[model samples]
Target: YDKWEMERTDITMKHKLEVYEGVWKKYSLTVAVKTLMEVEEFLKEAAVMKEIKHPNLVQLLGVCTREPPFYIITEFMTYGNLLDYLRECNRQEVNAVVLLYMATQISSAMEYLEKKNFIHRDLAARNCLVGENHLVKVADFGLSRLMTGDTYTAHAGAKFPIKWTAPESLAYNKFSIKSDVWAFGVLLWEIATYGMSPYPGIDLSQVYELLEKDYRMERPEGCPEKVYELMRACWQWNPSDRPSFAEIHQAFETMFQE
Candidate 1:
């Protein structure tokens, strides 16, 4: 049997196979089966994954449909995931520099995705995978969408993590690159809190209502003032109010050097 590594959330896995002279790896095929109500949804995800290529972005190796269920293959990230590391470090203080490093890697990847006109509508700590040497790769493109211009509309009934979604996304179905920045703010919160659940006591559906009403998680204890400020900027209520990933990357770079 091929070597398989399950994700922390059990949502996906990496399968490694040894061929004649080399090792081949791919992402497990379960994600495509989430909802079969529409073939277009499945095909869209397939087309996007097939077309996107980047070092920071998970690489789609290939797809197989010969077995009982089809699978999409991708580069296997060996170090497990970012959230796992955070959980292990729970209750222990993480240095501001280390936190910035992780955030910067995520921003770098998002910047690459933005260049290709793609928006990872779902950017959270759980979606990011960490490599052995501390390298970061953004995974789970199932919720990803190719942005045609500056803006796109979320489908009705479609929902993302309320704590991570931007205000405009909550108030309206409107989303943009800036909205992603808002999600980044929440991701920062997750990192600082070491994977603690966001908006801990609130029901998930109330997340948008609370966000629309100007509610947001307070900066977790022990998080640096500078980092907290950056998170605030990303959570600005107006969609156009958030910084671009490029700008966000620069902020972390600056903080890293200081």
Candidate 2:
């Protein structure tokens, strides 16, 4: 993998990272090269990607860690992030069933991470990449952390996505699978609305306070009642009250059967 970067094509900047289309000189394969803003962040992301393997999770093909301008190579996602893909897709053509299938794939991926005790603190539509056949793979592990126990305490003053975050996490800087569940619920809403931003009229500063007052977003237009119920389940105030990814995956499985 050290000799991977030979010919490079400019790609778009995403997640505040520069990603390029490159040919792996060794295998002669096209791959995505993510240029790290700094050594520490991408190293952690690279390590996490290397240790985890799942069909619904993006594949880490290789890495270039020999010198500065370090890069993490991954399988090229043809369509880019799910958020932009969903937004660009024809809204009427993509019914609840199609969106549900996409949600199921994401939940399945999260189930794998949950079982492995890895918490993807930043779970959202933008973090998932869409490939051929519209397959969605959970990507962007810059905020991911492996749990040694029940929860991981983030360093004080660390930044986090307030709108997608859970109550406990916002208040205490604590993260766990349950907090990931909260983000997943938000992701579901994003999918349901074809990538519309959550909380249309609300400000980020008011989110925590509103959530404390039991304010939750209304069901997305055209969203099924059951799916909305699942989202609500994921947003429960008590971390223990939120459903596990395995359970969420099972729910989606059941939906497909009927």
Candidate 3:
């Protein structure tokens, strides 16, 4: 039995939902607000999200700005966020198989986004939602962009989650589908570490300095060698050197025999 409730709210956004009404019905609503001044940016974000339609990706229902404040409505997730769940479980050790399962879902979503020539610049545990039957849905496309050619870069004043960003992005402000893969590597670490903080004790400015010098977070203890290898591949210095999501999915499927 899925339950619906108002989870939380802040100065910039309001979250509400609808869920399974009975044994088999599953539905949800995520209403997020955007200021009038930010409406143009919101619409641009919404347009890209609308083009992405995949089971592993959170569904974008529509956008409404006619009323006082603007809001983006999206699919409601039942299990909430992966980060919150990790905190509640107090379980730091995630099985390699479970991590692989989650990674597969994310890779699938990326595959869809890549097909549409869009890059999800931000990928992390906080933006992933688990649905009924253990389905994973990737959310938060605010930093997403449509890839135009061999080179794609972040816009001026564009902000990304530094903790999960690729080193090249910090150094050159350049990002591509490959850089997105790099971010996923950090996300992989986040999941395996049970949502542990990235680069703990380091400030944002310092992270830029460290990353520019080719620094990357070390894989925590107990991470499977195979999993670590996949993650490292994403962090390769050359953006073009990163593996595609299709390849990633194939590797995981072979490794998991799923």
Candidate 4:
């Protein structure tokens, strides 16, 4: 209750939720306070979030659950979400090398989560955040969970972002780290195209049908052939055929060096 400084009043809105920029009293650190909408879900999600920590993962600082107004405090990411960051940076003519670097950081974070038996079911550009030094950290865990086994199946009638979902997940209601890989491939396209919507002009209902017939998006304008190859590899029809986050991270590392 007493964590935030009384004088600060900065506020921002995201996805219709309120986010406040505040100063943490104990450490005098700048932090972002997210007002969580669902109490029960936030309790479980916060537990999962508090267990993980990495430079590329937004660190959860603390939480307020004493009353009706619940808040989840996290490190303040200066550049907000990666989608907007990429779009703005496009005008700055940020080099491909820098873009590759950002992707590498995301891969490193995902690799860490994969090693810990966690599946980030919602891996997309909009779910990641950027901070100082061009640092991009994986954020948002509302759809994330610790997988007890190799795969997770959603309950009936759950909604998901169709374009970013894997075929297996979309077809069987299954999600695994491989499904995350598929989304990562889509995220790569987002980076390549400065955050343009995927499969432009293609109806969402037709995506699966097209994929069933071996359709894949053409490389983004000026997208390197090698990067497009990696994206295609991630979108392999079979989950087992896709590269692990480890392999993806290595690929980005290699590209960053070129």
Candidate 5:
């Protein structure tokens, strides 16, 4: 997508996108089509997807539109995923400005998706992709909940990123745009701490037990008070108490401008 600007010219692993060391690279050009005859009304789906474009959101370029083993093509980020990239930066001195910019970008994308009536069920540092110039795009929508008016259908017993999940979702099998907000809060912690794992002294098995008692992860080391405040807003136990992505993005935008 976008003229394959960030795609690597290198090749490996079947020539598809590569997700090694946190980067997810893209495909080549010069026409690589075989045979379709399978995907009836395929481009229709691709058309709606292609219409959705945002600087902070990884875009869907096009679909194979070919035969049996059809696939979709999209933009890639060389930095792989935000999680590993944050950790990599943690090895050295991290520029606070750069990390805040990344947080702003991700929040901006999440705001876009929220406006589009999409709920990113898995919004975490690991699920985001980072491109050149430190561009972070929200990726991995395998579990994104598209709006069906208000609350989307909830899944039962499906695995989730618990540490990055909200309290209400963990208790009841419920999912909504609000639950996504909770995950985003935890995501902010990951960035604030340069990919520090969520809930340091707590085990995943009993993390929720503590969470029910208002046990949230502490402020990340040396994290700015305002950043930690935003995370706290997102971690509100009552889903309705959490701020909307638009509000969150605006706060981050303000932080970025400052």
Candidate 6:
């Protein structure tokens, strides 16, 4: 990384993410500005993207911090992000089997991340992308944390998705695969409810208190009993009690048999 090149990038300009044609041919990429404020953060994210290689995760090909508006390029997902897709469908009768397939894909990718010890700090439908063949790939890595070992202690002032965060994380600012599993359970709720907001009436300010009292959101109005049960398991007060992504992945695998 050439230090001087990063010095002049202008992040305030319009960020353009589109399919561009160049010498290498057609490419889908994200072109954004990198202000002095975000250069370090931007570089860190780019570096991590380079370290991880997975089909379910977006691939970061390169970074161009040379000119005024620095950019990051990666593959384009055709189907679009899961949140928009679900909300656009608006609780329409999407195929149950297809829902299960999408669940499997996310869990499968999450399973891969778990095996590699990557803690996706933010695990929400919005962060997952739907590609061709309805493939659900976990996309955003902005809050993605690749741990050196078991746990990563967050900075004191760090903010995260309180609705999707686990009890321990909220209580202690500690993050782990278990916490990720907690978010996965919320992701499950999101998928089950077709992008419905979790904790319907509870304000963000009140969520922590409710969770501390051992309260969990009930199953979605019409969620499968089994999946809701899994959500409960993932939301266990004790992190050790949560199911591994492997188990979560296999549960979906077992569903196809039944």
**Local accuracy of candidate 2 as per-residue lDDT tens digits, 23-67:** 666667677877755677767677777777899988887666666
Alpha-carbon deviation at 137 in model 6, angstroms: 1.1
What's the lDDT of the predicted structure labeled candidate 1? 0.70
lDDT of 4 by residue, 1-258 (tens): 344223222323233326777667657777887776467887777777777879999988777766646677778888889998888775455678888998899999999998888888889999999888889999856646656347888988888899999998778899999999999999999998989999999999999999989899999998999999999999999899999999999989988987
Q: Higher-lDDT candidate among 1 and 4?
A: 4
Whole-model Cα lDDT of every candidate shown, in order: 0.70, 0.83, 0.69, 0.83, 0.71, 0.74
* TM-score, per-candidate, Cα-based: 0.77, 0.89, 0.78, 0.89, 0.80, 0.82
Give one clash count per candidate, in the order shown.
2, 0, 1, 0, 5, 0
The 10-residue segment with the lowest total lDDT in model 1: 16-25
**Candidate 3 per-residue C-alpha lDDT over 55-119 given as tens digits, one digit per residue, 9 for 90 to 100:** 99877655544444544556667778888766666343445666678888888888777777777
Clashing pairs in 5: 22-79, 22-80, 22-81, 23-80, 36-66
Candidate 6 per-residue lDDT over residues 8-112, each given as its tens digit? 222223323333322212322333222323677876776666666777777665566665355555555766679888878634455667677888888888888
The regions of model 5 sitting more than 4 angstroms off are 1-48, 90-93, 143-145
- Number of the candidate with higher TM-score, 2 or 3: 2
Report the Cα lDDT for candidate 5. Answer: 0.71
- Candidate 4 residue 222 Cα shift, in angstroms, is 1.0
Q: What is the lDDT of residue 217 in candidate 3?
A: 77
C-alpha RMSD in Å of predicted model 1 compared with the true structure = 7.0
**What is the number of residue pairs that collide in model 3?**
1
How well is each residue in 1-258 modelled by candidate 1, as lDDT tens digits?
123322223234333222111133233332321212355565566567777766777776555433323445565566557888778852434566677778888888888777777888788888898766567888855646656357778889886677777767777777788888888888999988888888888998777777767777898998988889888888887766778888888888888878
The per-residue C-alpha lDDT of model 6 at residue 226 equals 89
